[PDB]
Amino acid sequence: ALLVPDKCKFLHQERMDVCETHLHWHTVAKETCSEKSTNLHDYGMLLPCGIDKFRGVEFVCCPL
């Protein structure tokens, strides 16, 4: 479980049809925080579908 601090927002994204890399998900997360002028505070991999493969990510974006 992730603590959500200092008025940051919690976001999850999950696609049954998708089994992708950590590298993929870290970018998605980072591009989503970035897109709203907020930083990626940290993240977590959802549903292992293989070595370095997952179907989702949860993450925390904080205000600049």
UniProtKB/Swiss-Prot annotation:
Binding-site positions, Cu(2+) 1: H22, H26, Y43
Impact upon substituting H12N: Binds copper. Forms dimer
Residues the record lists as binding Zn(2+) 1: E58, C61, C62
Record annotation: effect of changing H26A: Loss of a copper binding site
Site (Required for Cu(2+) reduction): M45
Disulfides per UniProt: C8-C62, C19-C49, C33-C61
CuBD subdomain as annotated region, ranges: 6-64
Protein name, UniProt field: N-APP
